[PDB]
Amino acid sequence: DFDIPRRSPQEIAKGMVAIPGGTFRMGGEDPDAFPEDGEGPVRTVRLSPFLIDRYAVSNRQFAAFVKATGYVTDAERYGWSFVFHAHVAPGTPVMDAVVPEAPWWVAVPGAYWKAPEGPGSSITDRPNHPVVHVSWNDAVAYATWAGKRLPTEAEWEMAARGGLDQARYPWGNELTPRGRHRCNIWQGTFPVHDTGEDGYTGTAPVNAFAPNGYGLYNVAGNVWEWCADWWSADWHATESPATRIDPRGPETGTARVTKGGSFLCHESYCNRYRVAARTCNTPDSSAAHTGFRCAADP
């Protein structure tokens, strides 16, 4: 509904790192991987050079987009969004809706990006947190307004891997090297109690913890990140140029790829904060643990 504003390369590039063109080994061979996630095979992928944000898009940055355009997010058009059960303050009205197999997810009317736990919450103390309750549609809109685009899954994974060849995490193979926490995921007993041992039992600021070798922050944990690709478990098992040179994912689908894991992920349940991990969500869905960062062409 809004015209695309004129932006300079250096304005688009602010807050982004230049990933140089090259190959990298994409995917995972973890024996415990859920086969339905299609984390394999591991393959070599060549990519044209691209820019990617150091940070997930923040609340402050999303509010600017909303203020400049008047964009209405899918969660506002719908009237509700998904809030984790422990974060719904008592008294808040909730739908009786049950996400099958995930009763910890609550449909809260009036939960959206500026009120992430429902009516009566605010983001005044979370300006540098990742924006959440943004659908894939909302993300594309921001990106296009900003002169950017969502990363492909391969761009996302190349950048999140930080110049490491087939490490488990963005920083290496140890979850907590030297016993220090490196991302915001779950600790304790999911979904009953998060001990917050890494410092956060919700979103953390987008600059939390140390960056990976390419300078990216919180590619592991904090919030799931929308990518451009249609989801599939097996399109990328074919060996062809379409799947190994600047791959765009399948031409069609019903859900869009999400990468990186979030503050709810934990080894005992999903184990999806590994950098090869992947899942999806339908493109107008939104939840309290899902955001995005942008990519751009140089």
Partner: peptide
């Protein structure tokens, strides 16, 4: 017992 679910979709509740 099946596959863990991290992406909750609007369609899943219908």
């Amino acid at each position: 017992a099946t596959t863990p679910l991290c992406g909750p979709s609007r369609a899943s509740i219908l």
